[PDB]
Amino acid sequence: MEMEKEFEQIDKSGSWAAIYQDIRHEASDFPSRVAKLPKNKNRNRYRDVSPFDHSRIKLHQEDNDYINASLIKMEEAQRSYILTQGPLPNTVGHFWEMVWEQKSRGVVMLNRVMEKGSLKCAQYWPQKEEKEMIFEDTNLKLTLISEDIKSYYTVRQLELENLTTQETREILHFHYTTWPDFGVPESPASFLNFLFKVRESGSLSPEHGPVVVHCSAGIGRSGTFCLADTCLLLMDKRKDPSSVDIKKVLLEMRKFRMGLIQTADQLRFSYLAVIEGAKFIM
Ligand SMILES: Cn1c2c(c3ccccc31)C[C@@H]1C[C@H]2[C@H](O)CN1
């Protein structure tokens, strides 16, 4: 079926939970043996969210190459994404090592450091120009260059330096600051405006490594971001945009990381975002 009328048909019939449970039943199951090794317990935020072995990002290190991060490679859309958990106190150096090694231009953050009165990720970037951060375990230096605070999101320019080679690179930090502590946004308008700002920066384009996108577990809000981006790109590429099937795209993405889209409300929100976004594109 088309999307917008399939949407109204699920609303009128109140069957979002049944649609979402079908997706959960059909989703891929692949091994995640490296994630579960005892030496990696303090590298995982949640015991039930792990990268598959076949798609995990490897650190260029011979001691321990493990990080909780996955490469989502969308062949028809010609887009790739790295989805990862919010960094932990003992993985902030690994996080920036990955950004460096994978040649990423942009980092997309969809959570606040504290939500619901608890810490959802480490403070992993500097908040003042004159107070830079040094990660001694991976030999990197990170400096805040500029910050632009808007009503729904903040954009930061960062300088990442590999202290071993003295090479430097400019990284863009895109921080969506207004996702509610509970539920999903009422309107997709600010989320779509944010997606378009990331696109306009070059951070999603083939001349760079994959964008790094995270929330707390790296599957819920993060899944919504890449699902909406890929569906909108396919609607622009194909002769028949009504052939784009959001459930089929989501199942394709779940071949590369488990659990993408965590609730039926996030699934409905993803439909809404793609529907409204397709009208603005034209
Ligand atoms: C524009 N730019 C540059 C750097 C940089 C670091 C942070 C923000 C912006 C930056 C470092 C050097 C020179 C230039 C170049 O673009 C890259 N290499």
UniProtKB/Swiss-Prot annotation:
Oxidized on Cys-215; the Cys-SOH formed in response to redox signaling reacts with the alpha-amido of the following residue to form a sulfenamide cross-link, triggering a conformational change that inhibits substrate binding and activity. The active site can be restored by reduction. The modification N-acetylmethionine is found at M1. It catalyses: O-phospho-L-tyrosyl-[protein] + H2O = L-tyrosyl-[protein] + phosphate. Keywords: Acetylation, Endoplasmic reticulum, Hydrolase, Membrane, Oxidation, Phosphoprotein, Protein phosphatase, S-nitrosylation. Expressed in keratinocytes (at protein level). Residues 3-277 form the Tyrosine-protein phosphatase domain. The keyword Transmembrane does not apply. It comes from the Eukaryota. One of its GO terms (molecular function) is non-membrane spanning protein tyrosine phosphatase activity. The modification S-nitrosocysteine is found at C215. The modification Phosphoserine is found at S50, S242, S243. The modification Cysteine sulfinic acid (-SO2H) is found at C215. Its EC number is 3.1.3.48. Interacts with EPHA3 (phosphorylated); dephosphorylates EPHA3 and may regulate its trafficking and function. Interacts with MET. Interacts with NCK1. Tyrosine-protein phosphatase which acts as a regulator of endoplasmic reticulum unfolded protein response. Mediates dephosphorylation of EIF2AK3/PERK; inactivating the protein kinase activity of EIF2AK3/PERK. May play an important role in CKII- and p60c-src-induced signal transduction cascades. May regulate the EFNA5-EPHA3 signaling pathway which modulates cell reorganization and cell-cell repulsion. May also regulate the hepatocyte growth factor receptor signaling pathway through dephosphorylation of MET. Belongs to the protein-tyrosine phosphatase family. Non-receptor class 1 subfamily. This is Tyrosine-protein phosphatase non-receptor type 1. It comes from Homo sapiens (Human).
